[PDB]
Non-structural protein 3
Amino acid sequence: SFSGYLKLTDNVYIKNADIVEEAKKVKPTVVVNAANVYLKHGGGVAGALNKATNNAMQVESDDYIATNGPLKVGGSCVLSGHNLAKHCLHVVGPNVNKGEDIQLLKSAYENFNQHEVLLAPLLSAGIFGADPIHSLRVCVDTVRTNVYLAVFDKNLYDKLVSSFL
Ligand SMILES: CS(=O)(=O)Cc1nc2ccccc2[nH]1
């Protein structure tokens, strides 16, 4: 199962790890992708997860968008986890670099409550432009299910743990 995670709360855990390497090792029931509304997995966590699936995630995602149209900012969809997990929960946090409403971050984390346990990144952090300290706070105050957070950046991981209230 999950190993080397620091316990932050009753249900939130955190580790300095590459979420792709964590997914390949654990093969969790659910891996969360930091998706955009189009499911275009170009960079950040999305690009890295998609590359690990040999682009199968993108092919499946393009079929999903062709059928359903785009997701909402704050929304999600469940697709296959391919070689990484049973399922991938594609969650759209607001991208502050694209001017999206940061209040939608709580709505984005509410999607995690539909799954008992998830391997996840901090939503809207990294290339999405939001403050990761704020994202962790919203995560702990919103998610009630078991979430194992993988933070790629060591320096950010140390800052998140040391500043956690
Ligand atoms: C696995 S990779 O694509 O070679 C490198 C990588 N790993 C990441 C984890 C989180 C965000 C971006 C990331 N880029």
